[PDB]
Ligand binder design. Structure first.
Ligand SMILES: Nc1ncnc2c1ncn2[C@@H]1O[C@H](COP(=O)(O)OP(=O)(O)OP(O)(O)=S)[C@@H](O)[C@H]1O
Length: 311
C-alpha cells in the first residue's frame, strides 16, 4: 500500500461516480456544483434545503406525507413557477380533488394547464409516459401514487409492478427531454406502490404538518416541516420549515423573515423584527404584512438571502 487515505479515497470514490453516477457517494459537508436547472418551490426555505434552489429538472420527485400537510400546495406551487417561466405543466388526476381557485391564487394558470383523469393506473402512467415524450412538458405531476389501481381490481404482485414498469420505462425518457416529474404519495402509515419509486425517486420529500398557525382569532393556516430524506442531486437530510395560510399558499413574506433572522439580516429581540435600523413591526404576523405590502424591501432581503447562500 502507499497513499494518504484521502488521495486513495477520492480516487475510488471518483471511480464510483464514473460507474454508478454523480450522487452516488457524498460527504454531507459538500457545496457540490449547481446545474443551471431548477424549479423554485416558492419556499426560499425549502429550495435552499434542496441544495440547488428548487426541484431538479429531469428527475422524478416523490412528495409523501399525511393529508392536509401541504404536499400538493407545494406541487401546485412547483407548477406555478416552471409555468410562469414559459413551461408547459400537465396534472394527471386520479384523486378528482383539485381546487382551481386555490391553484389560481398560487400562481398556476389553470386554463393553460393539462388535466387528465385516467381510468386505470396503467393508463394514467401511459398518457403520462407518452405525454412526457413529446418533450413539450416541463413539469408533470401524478396525484396519488396510491389512486393508481390497475384494470384488474375493477373486474378480476399488485401495483408495484405497474409502478416499477412505468418508472423504468419512464425514468430513461423523463430526462432526455428535461421534464421533472412529481408524485404525491401518502396515508399508509402516520408515525402501496413504494418500492419502485422509493428507488427511482432522485429526491424524496417528507411533508408533515407541525402546527396550526394561530392568528389571534382561530388560525390563518399551518406550518409545515419538510425533510428531504433522499437527495441524489446534492447532500440529503437537510430540512426546511415554512407557513401555509388557509387559501393563499406558502407565505413568501413569512418565509423571508424566518430566513431573514436565522441568517442575520433581520434583528429581533423585543418581539420587534427590525431590518437594519429600519423596523418592520411587533409580532411575526405584523412584520409579515410589512413585507407583504413592501415588495421593495422584501426583494432586498430575498436578494441578500440568496447571495449569502445559493445563487
Ligand atoms: N380550497 C381551499 N381553501 C382554503 N384552504 C385550502 C384549500 N385547499 C387547500 N387549503 C390549505 O392547504 C393546506 C394543505 O394542502 P393540501 O392540498 O391538503 O396538501 P396535502 O398535500 O396536504 O393534500 P391532501 O394530500 O391532504 S389534498 C391546508 O392547511 C389547507 O388549509
Amino acid at each position: 500500500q502507499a497513499p494518504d487515505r484521502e488521495k486513495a479515497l477520492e480516487l475510488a470514490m471518483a471511480q464510483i461516480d464514473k460507474n454508478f453516477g454523480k450522487g452516488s457517494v457524498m460527504r454531507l459537508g459538500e457545496e457540490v456544483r449547481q446545474p443551471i436547472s431548477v424549479i423554485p418551490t416558492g419556499s426560499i426555505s425549502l429550495d435552499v434545503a434542496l441544495g440547488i434552489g428548487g426541484l431538479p429538472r429531469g428527475r422524478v420527485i416523490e412528495i409523501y406525507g399525511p393529508e392536509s400537510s401541504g404536499k400538493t400546495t407545494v406541487a401546485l406551487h412547483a407548477v406555478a413557477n416552471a409555468q410562469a417561466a414559459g413551461g408547459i405543466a400537465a396534472f394527471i388526476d386520479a384523486e378528482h380533488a383539485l381546487d382551481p381557485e386555490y391553484a389560481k391564487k398560487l400562481g398556476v394558470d389553470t386554463d393553460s394547464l393539462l388535466v387528465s383523469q385516467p381510468d386505470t393506473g396503467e393508463q394514467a402512467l401511459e398518457i403520462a409516459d407518452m405525454l412526457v415524450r413529446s418533450g413539450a412538458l416541463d413539469i408533470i405531476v401524478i396525484d396519488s401514487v396510491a389512486a393508481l389501481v390497475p384494470r384488474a381490481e375493477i373486474e378480476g404482485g399488485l401495483q408495484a409492478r405497474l409502478m416499477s414498469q412505468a418508472l423504468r420505462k419512464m425514468t430513461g425518457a423523463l430526462n432526455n427531454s428535461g421534464t421533472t416529474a412529481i408524485f404525491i404519495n401518502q396515508l399508509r402509515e402516520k408515525i402501496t406502490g413504494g418500492k419502485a419509486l422509493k428507488f427511482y425517486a432522485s429526491v424524496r420529500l417528507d411533508v408533515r404538518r407541525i402546527e396550526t398557525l394561530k392568528d389571534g382569532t382561530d388560525a390563518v393556516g399551518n406550518r409545515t416541516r419538510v425533510k428531504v430524506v433522499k437527495n441524489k442531486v446534492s447532500p440529503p437530510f437537510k430540512q426546511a420549515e415554512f407557513d401555509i395560510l388557509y387559501g393563499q399558499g406558502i407565505s413568501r413574506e413569512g418565509s423571508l423573515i424566518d430566513m431573514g433572522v436565522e441568517h442575520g439580516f433581520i434583528r429581533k429581540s423585543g418581539s420587534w423584527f427590525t431590518y437594519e435600523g429600519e423596523q418592520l413591526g411587533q409580532g411575526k404576523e405584523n412584520a409579515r404584512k410589512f413585507l407583504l405590502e413592501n415588495t421593495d424591501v422584501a426583494n432586498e432581503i430575498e436578494k441578500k438571502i440568496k447571495e449569502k447562500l445559493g445563487i
